[PDB]
Amino acid sequence: GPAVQFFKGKNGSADQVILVT
Amino acid sequence: DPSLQIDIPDALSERDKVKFTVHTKTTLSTFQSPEFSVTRQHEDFVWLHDTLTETTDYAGLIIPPAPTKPDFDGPREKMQKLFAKMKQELEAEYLAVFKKTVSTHEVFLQRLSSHPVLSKDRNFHVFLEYDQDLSVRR
C-alpha cells in the first residue's frame, strides 16, 4: 500500500517528501 | 570526531515501519570500507541502545538516549481518508514528522560516534556496517 519517501536536502538543497505507490 | 562521520540522508515510511539510510564516512581501518550505507529500522536503533546499556563494561558511561519511535499515524490517517490545499498540509505534516525523527535518530548516532569508548563498540560497528537486515540477526 502507501509509502512516503523523505530526502534530506542537507546544506544547499531543501528537504523533500514523495508519495510512492 | 572527524574520523567517523554519520548521517541519515533519506528515510521511508511504509505501513507502520520507518526505514532510515545510515551513511558512514570514516578514515578508520577498524571498518572495512571508508564510505558505506546500510538500511536500519527504528527497532535496530532501540536494539543498539539497549545492547550498550546492558554492556557491563560501560556502566557509568554517558550513553546518549535512544531516539523515540516515529509517529506517522496522524499523517497516514489523513492520507487514507483523503483538495490541493488539504494535500499540501498533508505533505507539510509528513515533512515535519520526518525532519524531527531523522534528526533524533541521526543525533543518537552522532553522539555515539563522538564518544571515545562507545564509538569503538563492536555492536555499534555492526549497526553501521552489516549489509543485511539486523531484525532477522537478533
Author numbering:
A (entry chain B): 111 to 131
B (entry chain A): 28 to 109, 121 to 176
Could you give the paper's own sentences about this structure?
The core of the retromer complex is an evolutionary conserved trimer consisting of VPS35, VPS26 and VPS29, which recognizes specific endosomal cargo proteins. The largest and most well-characterized protein family controlling retromer activity is the sorting nexin (SNX) family, which is characterized by the presence of phox homology (PX) domains. One of the effector proteins is IncE, which specifically interacts with SNX5/6 via their PX domain. Overexpression of IncE in mammalian cells inhibits retromer- and SNX5/6-mediated endosomal trafficking.
To understand this interaction in more detail, we solved the crystal structure of the PX5:IncE109–132 complex. The protein crystallized in P1 space group, with two SNX5:IncE dimers per asymmetric unit. The structure was refined to 1.9 Å with a final Rfree of 0.213. The resolved model contains residues 28–176 from PX5 (one copy of the PX5 residues 110–120 not modeled due to poor density) and residue 111–131 from IncE. In the complex structure, IncE binds to a hydrophobic groove on PX5. IncE forms an anti-parallel β-sheet, which extends the three anti-parallel β-sheets formed by residues 36–62 of PX5. A long protruding double helix in PX5, together with its β strand residues 36–40, forms the hydrophobic groove for IncE binding. However, the protruding long double helix is bent toward the IncE-binding site, with the largest movement being 11.5 Å for Cα of Ser115, which is located on the tip of the double helix. IncE interacts with PX5 through an extensive network of hydrogen bonds and hydrophobic interactions, resulting in a buried surface area of 646 Å2. PX5 presents a hydrophobic floor by the side chains of L133, F136, V140 and the aliphatic side chain portions of K137 and Y132, which forms hydrophobic interaction with IncE residues V114, F116 and V127.
